[PDB]
Give the backbone structure.
Amino acid sequence: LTKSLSIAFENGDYAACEKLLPPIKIELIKNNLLIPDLSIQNDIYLNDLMITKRILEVGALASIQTFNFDSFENYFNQLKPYYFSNNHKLSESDKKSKLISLYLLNLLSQNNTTKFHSELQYLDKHIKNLEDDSLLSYPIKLDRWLMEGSYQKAWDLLQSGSQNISEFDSFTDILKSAIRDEIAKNTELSYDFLPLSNIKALLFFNNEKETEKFALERNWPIVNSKVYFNNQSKEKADYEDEMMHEEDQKTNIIEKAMDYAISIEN
Amino acid sequence: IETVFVKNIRMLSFEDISKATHLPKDNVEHLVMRAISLGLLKGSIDQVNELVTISWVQPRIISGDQITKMKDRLVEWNDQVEKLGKKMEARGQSIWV
């Protein structure tokens, strides 16, 4: 029953995992009660721990493979305290090293960069040289290139990143898109216009018809094979003036001078 | 004198004036200059921006149509002070002693 999830992953039928998982979830509570959730560790508990952990890890990979990012997030959170408590004697796996690589990609692809650095700080002392960076290089180096602002080195690491498959292609494909939007925002400031050809090279497409379609949806008109970056910018700005909170945040002349006199006079 | 008075703007491109009076640009420049001598308009001329910025209009007879135009200008400033006055009530609440 419990054991079925474990052999189902080896088949390679990863939707079969998910449709099997609900009974195993009720039976996973029973597993949690056997360990004290590691508030004391013993050798009776050490056999049991492997059981509790094994169920989570194979669900975790299985969920990513059916493109259920949500379910993945919950799994990772459960698992993390189990590696975290206690001197090592069953606090790592072959699977772990791969698992941390996948979570770091999910944060980057959603563009929550804030949580990307916090999480790495906490992560650091489990992967420093003990699992080392061996697979973890892939979101880490990408990160080095994004901070520097080498969108070029960043693109190549993704491009060579498809030869080696572990299952990272579910987040590489999303990160390809993330880059384009970041570039798209930065180039509005730089210039008003780039010819159609110069747009394709920068914003990373393989068809000149995709480049033009993307622009129309994003609110740049191509008229006379020149883009007008200024359009969207005017429209966003027009919208902020449309909504009203607005008189105080900027502050009137009259308002500044009324504030001085009343501070004094109390 | 009619075009400046009735408009709430007081700068006009020569193009508008040229089309109205069916004059060249040489003669708009004389006409404007004459108004200034006789004292029927006073102002100054930018032939480099191509405007005539009038700065004073001679009061004249005010007929049925003009009163309506005069009147509307007054409603706008009346409402403008009233709106503006609420904020100045609002701010500096503590002291009105």
